[PDB]
Design a protein around this ligand. Structure first.
Ligand SMILES: N[C@H]1CC[C@H](CNC(=O)[C@@H]2C=CCn3c(=O)n(CCS(=O)(=O)c4ccccc4)c(=O)n32)CC1
Ligand code: NA
Ligand code: NA
Lengths: 10, 279
């Protein structure tokens, strides 16, 4: 339901 | 040091909507309100890397430190026991779902510090934990630390009938989910009522909050609101103080049932102790 986050953050 | 002065209110000499209620009890979320932008700049999201989901609420006490519930990190009965690589802290948010592009900041954790004596086996006594962020966050109009009380602030606000405020991205109902952070102002209830309301052994690192079945007003924290702050504004130096941490409850907004919170003040020393040994 959550928009994805800066893939740079995982 | 700048603690509890919200850049978009106190700073600018603006007052949010329900402040009055707070302040007029000093004698001058379920069934809550939509927060105003920048109204709770110390509110943190505790976010799981995979699944990418919200686990709890939290507060920003420093530029390096976050305050949450112990039970957020570690609950064996439920196979819960998180490590500082399975989480991401999201600061400066409002909407719950979306990645607020240039307003919110996402940090990685450097170390978790559970209360040595958190009692997960009986009653959640000492439900408090500190996380220290990999790197410090810059404050902006939306990101800003809350204050931590002193023996005399805790002394005079922490009283039956005083309103404090709770905030969360959590459940809007027991059996509902918001798009935006919610808020609810709840009164501190006396010990006796707190006690006679449950079977659990009430300790002093605890205080309860909610209205009586009889005041014609409801309100409570709920599922997902854990760790979030219970705050008060001193009418004295009109800064916001984090007085409790959403610990435990029996249902959500259940009549003749109240919210139990960690007594932030009572554990303040341990919190000092950990900030200047390794912070
Ligand atoms: N109205 C609530 C405010 C607080 C949050 C988070 N609480 C939680 O989910 C916490 C977290 C872990 C354990 N747990 C329980 O078993 N119980 C149930 C209330 S209880 O009286 O059964 C209880 C008392 C002491 C220990 C465990 C449970 C409880 O509240 N918790 C939800 C909505
Ligand atoms: Na009792
Ligand atoms: Na209630």
């Amino acid at each position: 339901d959550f928009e994805e986050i800066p893939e740079e953050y995982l | 040091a700048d603690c509890g002065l919200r850049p978009l209110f106190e700073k600018k000499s603006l007052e949010d909507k329900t402040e009055r209620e707070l302040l007029e009890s000093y004698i001058d979320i379920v069934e809550g309100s939509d927060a105003e932008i920048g109204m709770s700049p110390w509110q943190v999201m505790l976010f799981r890397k995979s699944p990418q989901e919200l686990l709890c609420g939290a507060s920003l006490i420093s530029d390096r430190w976050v305050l949450t519930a112990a039970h957020c990190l570690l609950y064996p009965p439920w196979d819960k026991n998180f490590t500082e690589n399975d989480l991401l802290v999201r600061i400066g948010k409002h909407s719950r779902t979306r990645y607020e592009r240039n307003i919110e900041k996402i940090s990685m954790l450097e170390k978790i510090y559970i209360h040595p004596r958190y009692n997960w086996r009986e009653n959640l006594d000492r439900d408090i934990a500190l996380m220290k962020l990999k790197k410090p966050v810059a404050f902006s109009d939306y990101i800003h630390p809350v204050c931590l009380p002193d023996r005399e602030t805790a002394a005079s606000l922490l009283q039956a009938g005083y309103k404090g405020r709770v905030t969360g991205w959590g459940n809007l109902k027991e059996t509902g989910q918001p798009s935006v952070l919610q808020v609810v102002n709840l009164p501190i209830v006396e010990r006796p009522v707190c006690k006679d309301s449950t079977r659990i052994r009430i300790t002093d690192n605890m205080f309860c909050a909610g209205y009586k079945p009889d005041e014609g007003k409801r309100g409570d924290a709920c599922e997902g609101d854990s760790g979030g702050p219970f705050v008060m504004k001193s009418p004295f130096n009109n800064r916001w103080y984090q007085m409790g941490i959403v610990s435990w409850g029996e249902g959500c907004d259940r009549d003749g049932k109240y919210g139990f919170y960690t007594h932030v003040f009572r554990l303040k020393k341990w919190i000092q102790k950990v900030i200047d040994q390794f912070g």
